[PDB]
Design a protein around this motif. Sequence first.
Motif, mmCIF file in Angstrom:
data_model
loop_
_atom_site.group_PDB
_atom_site.id
_atom_site.type_symbol
_atom_site.label_atom_id
_atom_site.label_comp_id
_atom_site.label_asym_id
_atom_site.label_seq_id
_atom_site.Cartn_x
_atom_site.Cartn_y
_atom_site.Cartn_z
ATOM 1 N N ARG A 1 0.832 -1.197 0.000
ATOM 2 C CA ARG A 1 0.000 0.000 0.000
ATOM 3 C C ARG A 1 0.870 1.252 0.000
ATOM 4 N NH1 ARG A 1 -5.688 1.228 2.331
ATOM 5 N NH2 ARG A 1 -5.616 3.492 2.675
ATOM 6 N N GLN A 2 0.449 2.252 -0.752
ATOM 7 C CA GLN A 2 1.173 3.491 -0.852
ATOM 8 C C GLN A 2 0.226 4.646 -0.611
ATOM 9 O OE1 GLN A 2 4.192 4.987 -1.503
ATOM 10 N NE2 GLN A 2 4.938 3.015 -0.770
ATOM 11 N N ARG A 3 0.659 5.662 0.108
ATOM 12 C CA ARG A 3 -0.199 6.778 0.384
ATOM 13 C C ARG A 3 -0.358 7.648 -0.836
ATOM 14 N NH1 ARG A 3 0.469 12.046 4.172
ATOM 15 N NH2 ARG A 3 -1.554 12.848 3.533
ATOM 16 N N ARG A 4 -1.551 8.172 -1.078
ATOM 17 C CA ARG A 4 -1.772 9.063 -2.188
ATOM 18 C C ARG A 4 -1.928 10.483 -1.638
ATOM 19 N NH1 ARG A 4 -5.636 5.304 -4.649
ATOM 20 N NH2 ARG A 4 -4.521 3.348 -4.973
ATOM 21 N N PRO A 5 -1.691 11.518 -2.451
ATOM 22 C CA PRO A 5 -1.783 12.893 -1.931
ATOM 23 C C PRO A 5 -3.048 13.260 -1.179
ATOM 24 C CG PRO A 5 -1.126 12.874 -4.210
ATOM 25 C CD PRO A 5 -1.594 11.510 -3.911
ATOM 26 N N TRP A 6 -4.185 12.851 -1.682
ATOM 27 C CA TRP A 6 -5.442 13.071 -1.000
ATOM 28 C C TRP A 6 -5.758 12.139 0.177
ATOM 29 C CZ3 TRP A 6 -4.731 12.520 -6.120
ATOM 30 C CH2 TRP A 6 -4.819 11.233 -6.602
#
Length: 454
Positions: A1-6
């Motif tokens: 899992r990778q964090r997205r800007p929003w």
Amino acid sequence: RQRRPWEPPLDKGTVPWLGHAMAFRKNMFEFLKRMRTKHGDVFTVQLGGQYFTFVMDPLSFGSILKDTQRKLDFGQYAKKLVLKVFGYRSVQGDHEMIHSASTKHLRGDGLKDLNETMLDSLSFVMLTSKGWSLDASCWHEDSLFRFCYYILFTAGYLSLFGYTKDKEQDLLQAGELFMEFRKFDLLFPRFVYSLLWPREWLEVGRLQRLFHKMLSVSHKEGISNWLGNMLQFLREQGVPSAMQDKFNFMMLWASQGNTGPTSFWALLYLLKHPEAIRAVREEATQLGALQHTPVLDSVVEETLRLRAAPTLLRLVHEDYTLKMSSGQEYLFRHGDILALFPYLSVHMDPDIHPEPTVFKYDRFLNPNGSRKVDFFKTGKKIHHYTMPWGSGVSICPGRFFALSEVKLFILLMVTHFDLELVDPDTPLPHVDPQRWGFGTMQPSHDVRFRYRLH
Ligand code: HEM
Ligand SMILES: C[C@@]12C(=O)CC[C@H]1[C@@H]1CCC3=CC(=O)CC[C@]3(C)[C@H]1C=C2c1cccnc1
């Protein structure tokens, strides 16, 4: 899992493949308190299997709890948890039946007739179990916790699951159940957190089998309509009796797991605050008049606010978007678990409740003795100023009964007994952190007290 800007901050841990489970489980309240000051009011962490996004902003509860567009979900997840925990296989419509049966028999008119029964059961257990000596001015010493949680358990159990012709026998069996129940209660957090050694994993098995047998459907007279109604529904649907047994135990856990411990705290606070116990005693001196006890109502809420600490959980069904008070727009992936911890966010909020760790018996009372329901944060209204029961269709459907149980218990205790704490100077036990998140908290150490007929 990778964090997205929003998305909100995602903290994977310093040992990335171990995550935060260990710190979370040791003390959830503290853990969430530290994550809040690190990332702020919203963040994501992996716990167990799922991903949890904690929302700590009191102001956002109203939005989330009322799911305008139905983006969140409680039922589906609830289903998953009782199976893994209790081994109960949900059937089509059984939830609907629970809350349908609850309102019909745990509220209003069904509650009145049930409370009658409670009072009878509650007086019988209290009179018969108190302990005696030919000398009526003879204090009896007990531990306050075990006392309240035995009285509330036996009475509530007999009021809900029925009784037989031999009243004394029933109190005996109810007391035996209580002992076993308490063993299971003690293990429960480490059971759910899967932090048990082999002896305990088997003990939890023995207790579950024992409870299935004792409450077995293949066996009284005069049981609550609540239970009678549900079982009947189950029977019609073709649920095997073996599964009915597992339902009866799940309901035992729900109905008797928190009432007792709540009574313990409520009474202990009254003993530690002379002005509060005076206030309820004076109010108590004037069959079915629970409706006119505003001071006692405030005392119960102030106990729940200080010792009830459940976790509100919602599965994100389809991607959810929340605007924060501050002004950000956060995104929640479907499959994430949105989670609220009202105890930290709302109960200990010093801006909503000033001097929050202090027991103020009149906290929920107005200068003119009325019921107070006006609470704010940064000048902004708060509808959920206390959430000891949950919200939505997860809310405890027996809350009105539980309140009747606790208030009745208090009244009889403060009215007919002389109470004293054995070591009044020693301060009150704090919360056992192992349980943070599991309903009503239980004390870190036990408190001795003494009592006698007035
Ligand atoms: C102090 C007393 C009690 C407390 C603090 C309490 C607290 C709670 C809480 C926090 C929940 C979960 C809320 C949520 O998921 O959002 C719950 C659920 C429940 N409680 Fe209680 N409870 C109490 C007494 C009772 C009693 C006496 C009964 C029945 C006689 C009962 C039956 C239930 C049931 C059936 C549920 C599950 C609701 C559902 O299926 O959606 N509780 N309780
Ligand atoms: C949220 C929680 C935690 O982590 C600490 C608070 C825990 C809940 C407290 C009350 C509760 C009562 C039941 O009758 C069955 C199980 C649950 C729902 C508990 C399960 C958890 C969990 C852990 C990982 C994955 N899913 C759920």
